[PDB]
């Protein structure tokens, strides 16, 4: 997923003719959620590594 | 105009997004009309040239 959800999408899949533009719902909230989940997972990874090193 | 009226047209003029496909009305009849008018004009040109050469 990367780090952001863009508001526009370029689509060229059948049955769409040539290339079309599509518009996403709540891109900013989804980007915020993505970044927050990444940060929480990183904190969890750091804590797990610290415990494992302590072992 | 050339010699034919195609049934499909590819259009990329503002405000159309990127490239779009458009569909023409009765292309075959218009092609027949084009060819017929070209033939009649050619006959007129030939007759005019013949008269001018006769002069």
Swiss-Prot record, chains A, B:
Taxonomic classification: Eukaryota, Metazoa, Chordata, Craniata, Vertebrata
Subcellular location: Cell membrane; Cell junction, Gap junction
Expression tissues: Highly expressed in neurons.
All ranges on the Extracellular side of the membrane: 1-32
Gene responsible for this protein: GJD2
Descriptive protein name: Gap junction delta-2 protein
Summary of subunit composition and partner proteins: A connexon is composed of a hexamer of connexins.
UniProt record similarity statement: Belongs to the connexin family. Delta-type subfamily.
Residues spanning the membrane: 33-55
Job of this protein: One gap junction consists of a cluster of closely packed pairs of transmembrane channels, the connexons, through which materials of low MW diffuse from one cell to a neighboring cell.
Domain of life: Eukaryota
Cysteine pairings via disulfide bonds: none
Portion held of the full protein: 221 to 275 of 321
């Amino acid at each position: 997923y990367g780090f952001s959800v863009p508001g526009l999408y370029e689509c060229n899949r059948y049955p769409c003719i040539k290339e079309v533009e599509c518009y996403v719902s709540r891109p900013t909230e989804k980007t915020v959620f993505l970044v927050f989940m990444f940060a929480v997972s990183g904190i969890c990874v750091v804590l797990n590594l610290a415990e494992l090193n302590h072992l």
